[PDB]
Amino acid sequence: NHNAQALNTLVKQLSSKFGAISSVLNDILSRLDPPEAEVQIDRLITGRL
Amino acid sequence: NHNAQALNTLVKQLSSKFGAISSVLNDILSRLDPPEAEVQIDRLITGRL
Amino acid sequence: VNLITRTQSYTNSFTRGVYYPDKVFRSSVLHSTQDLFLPFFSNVTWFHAIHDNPALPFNDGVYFASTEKSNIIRGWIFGTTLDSKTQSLLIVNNATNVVIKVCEFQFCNDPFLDVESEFRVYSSANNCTFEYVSQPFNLREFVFKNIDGYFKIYSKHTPINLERDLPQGFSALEPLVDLPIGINITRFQTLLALHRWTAGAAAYYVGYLQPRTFLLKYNENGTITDAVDCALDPLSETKCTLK
Amino acid sequence: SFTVEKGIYQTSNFRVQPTESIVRFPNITNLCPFHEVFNATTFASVYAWNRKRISNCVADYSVIYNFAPFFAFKCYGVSPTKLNDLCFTNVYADSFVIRGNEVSQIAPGQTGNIADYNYKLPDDFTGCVIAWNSNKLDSKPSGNYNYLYRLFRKSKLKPFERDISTEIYQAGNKPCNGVAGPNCYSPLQSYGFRPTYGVGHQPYRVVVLSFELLHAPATVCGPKKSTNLVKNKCVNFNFNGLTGTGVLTESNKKFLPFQQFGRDIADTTDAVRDPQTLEILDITPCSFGGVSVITPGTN
Amino acid sequence: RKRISNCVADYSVIYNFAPFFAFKCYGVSPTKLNDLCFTNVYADSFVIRG
Numbered sequence A, B: 001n002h003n004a005q006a007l008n009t010l011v012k013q014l015s016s017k018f019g020a021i022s023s024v025l026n027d028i029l030s031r032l033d034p035p036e037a038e039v040q041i042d043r044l045i046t047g048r049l
Numbered sequence C: 001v002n003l004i005t006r007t008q009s010y011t012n013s014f015t016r017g018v019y020y021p022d023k024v025f026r027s028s029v030l031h032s033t034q035d036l037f038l039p040f041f042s043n044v045t046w047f048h049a050i051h052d053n054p055a056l057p058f059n060d061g062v063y064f065a066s067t068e069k070s071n072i073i074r075g076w077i078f079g080t081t082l083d084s085k086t087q088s089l090l091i092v093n094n095a096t097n098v099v100i101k102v103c104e105f106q107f108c109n110d111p112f113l114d115v116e117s118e119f120r121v122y123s124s125a126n127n128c129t130f131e132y133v134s135q136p137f138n139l140r141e142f143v144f145k146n147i148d149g150y151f152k153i154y155s156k157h158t159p160i161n162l163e164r165d166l167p168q169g170f171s172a173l174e175p176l177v178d179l180p181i182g183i184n185i186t187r188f189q190t191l192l193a194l195h196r197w198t199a200g201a202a203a204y205y206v207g208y209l210q211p212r213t214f215l216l217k218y219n220e221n222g223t224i225t226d227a228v229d230c231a232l233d234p235l236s237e238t239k240c241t242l243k
Numbered sequence D: 001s002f003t004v005e006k007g008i009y010q011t012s013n014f015r016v017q018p019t020e021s022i023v024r025f026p027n028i029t030n031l032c033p034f035h036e037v038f039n040a041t042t043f044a045s046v047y048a049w050n051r052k053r054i055s056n057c058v059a060d061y062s063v064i065y066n067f068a069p070f071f072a073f074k075c076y077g078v079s080p081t082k083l084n085d086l087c088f089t090n091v092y093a094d095s096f097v098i099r100g101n102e103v104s105q106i107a108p109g110q111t112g113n114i115a116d117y118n119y120k121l122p123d124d125f126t127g128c129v130i131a132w133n134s135n136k137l138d139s140k141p142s143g144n145y146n147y148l149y150r151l152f153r154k155s156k157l158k159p160f161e162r163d164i165s166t167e168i169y170q171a172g173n174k175p176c177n178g179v180a181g182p183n184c185y186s187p188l189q190s191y192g193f194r195p196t197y198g199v200g201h202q203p204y205r206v207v208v209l210s211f212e213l214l215h216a217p218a219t220v221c222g223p224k225k226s227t228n229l230v231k232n233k234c235v236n237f238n239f240n241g242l243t244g245t246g247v248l249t250e251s252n253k254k255f256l257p258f259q260q261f262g263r264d265i266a267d268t269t270d271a272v273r274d275p276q277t278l279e280i281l282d283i284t285p286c287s288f289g290g291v292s293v294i295t296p297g298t299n
Numbered sequence E: 001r002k003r004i005s006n007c008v009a010d011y012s013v014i015y016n017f018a019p020f021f022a023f024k025c026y027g028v029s030p031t032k033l034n035d036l037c038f039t040n041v042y043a044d045s046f047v048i049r050g
Ligand SMILES: *[C@@H]1O[C@H](CO)[C@@H](O)[C@H](O)[C@H]1NC(C)=O
Pocket: C010, C041, C042, C043
């Protein structure tokens, strides 16, 4: 039960925005120029780490 | 002693600014418009977490 | 003219008024969503109109239920003053089309269709910009709301058993139309069709929505079959917390 | 290190790579009427702003630079250079004229006379604002009085709300009865526009473009060619601006008529509807895995 | 340099006295100046190049 719960929580954590416009990398890349895109990608990277 | 010290440290940690203008949410909310206010609130949230 | 009268009563809503919160397909999952829903086990008002002084507030949304068969109900009106000083909607439905206009109508105290002249509904309409014409749209349930200038309508009609009171079970509603009205709405009225006048009778159920958080259950086919209201009783709160 | 001891080591991963690309856009042939919004030679007042709806057309935003002598866009949700790739549901254009020192008030989360009583923007606005000077067209030597703004109101305005009623604001307890007496005011003051005023007191024409995110079938976006559809291959796909990589297969899911996308637990799109032929497809990432190396000592 | 104290401050009317474009504030926001209450105000005026 503990292993399944931990894995499920880890998978479910991928839907958080962590303060960004969106939780999908492709949408952020397509909706913004790069220089505005690194600052959005950094929040997601830090949250997942 | 360990329990008391841990609780006291946790309570005392609430006075840090973590790089914001102030450590009080009400002052930040009253002194700034919202769009400048989320970026100030985020630092406090991350520090407390 | 004033020739229509109304009477009130109260009844229990049980668990009715669930609609799909978004146009996204899901299956075999439990989803928690915060929106405007009709609370479970709440008083809804039963209105009997016989041949009206409708000051019915709009609040944050309206749930309308009709179990009639003679098909006498036609359209609705929304506004805040219902005079020439403020624009008002004129959703009117007939056999072949539906027409939505929001102009500065001068409505009468008792509006109804002559049956098909609207002279008994309003007198004049001078300034407006928005018009819409489309295809017209057993128990029928409708949900009307407005958020940030967007007026949204959900609807669902289902065959019903021979029972006067509302049934037991679940039946999800589906969205039809969202429009950019962008005005202030406080009051709403309902229109009736009277032939020539001949006496008539009608009955309907009215309820008000509130901001609530719900836990919806999706089956393997993608339809909503069960719901839990997280602010009803401590047991439901525990169920929502435990997911 | 230059030497390896005996054992098994987890080194890296393997993945199948894409073969080609796919673009699928709906059937649109007409051109958007962006020309009518600009150079209209007549703009409405701020208290009654003009709204226009744009749908079912191909949008080319670059030509917008050739219609008005503005300096640059001010977009919030997206970038101006990326507007030629995204595909939206509907477009709204709101036009009016304001003073020079009020352009800063047309922004999400702003407070002021224009923001409170004339024009309010939502806190989650996704669009662009274009304002440019019009001193040559909206100024007279004797003063222009055809532009008015509201100053008195009982309460603030919700986003995208318009007020046209002209009444008498009643500050005092006594009823005004429609006369301009003490404590009773007319909540409409006319802008005083003259060519001798400073740059901060000159008329400015403002146009706000608002986009709707993709929730319904798309209707407005740029001229991108649509290629053919190929399945059973790890390929790059682009469906109405949704880009991804994977294998596309026929889907058995029973989509409702108003549903266009399908999601999973991890909030990743796995079911799509083709814009041209209304068919349901499912997407699966192509093969991937891990590689381990077994070796004795290098000695 | 001018010192301002013991008065009610309405900053909006400042927009009606000079043909400037917008404020450039650092510690606070221009729209929130009508709610805060301070101790003293100082105004420094001069002329420089563009
Ligand atoms: C509905 O109203 C009746 C009286 O009007 C009251 O007795 C009853 O408790 C109410 N029901 C609910 C759920 O509040």
